[PDB]
Amino acid sequence: SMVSIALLREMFEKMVVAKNAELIGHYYDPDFVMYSDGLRQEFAEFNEGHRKIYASAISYAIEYDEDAWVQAPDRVAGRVWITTSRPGEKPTRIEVILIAAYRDCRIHRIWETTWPS
């Protein structure tokens, strides 16, 4: 496989599912910018926002549409379902189509849209 897809999947497992905010600076470049559903967020705000939510009672599960992966040098696109659970609530499933571009094996840009928003 290509390096980018493997790193993206590792980030989703070890950072997101594990809610490990100490790995944000491991997987994401200091100049990272996220574009998501009309919002633009640079590294510092992405980092602080994820530190706060990972400290909450939420939990995450992640799965992928294997048929949708696109992989190229320093780039990957995929179709991801993120299922979020909170104590006392029904889980909610969000579909994300995302493009990730890497610099020196860290995520430098993500562009994503989600359904529902």
Binding site for Na ion (CB under 5 A): 9, 12-13
Kindly tell me which residue out of 15, 98, 102, 107 binds its own copies, with binding defined by CB under 8 A.
98
Asked if 47 and 24 count as a contact pair (C-beta separation under 8 A), the reply is yes
Tell me the residue length of the chain: 117
Residues 6 or more apart from 39 whose CB is under 8 A from it?
none
Q: Point out which span in 13-21, 40-48, 81-89, 92-100 binds its own copies (CB under 8 A).
A: 92-100
79 is a contact residue toward its own copies (CB under 8 A): yes
Count CA atoms within 13 Å of residue 83 on its CB side.
Answer: 7
Structure token digits, residue 80: 């991801």
Q: Which does 23 bind (CB under 5 to 8 A by kind): its own copies, Na ion, none?
A: none
List of residues contacting its own copies (CB under 8 A):
35, 37-38, 65, 67-68, 70-72, 75-79, 95-99, 101, 109, 111-117
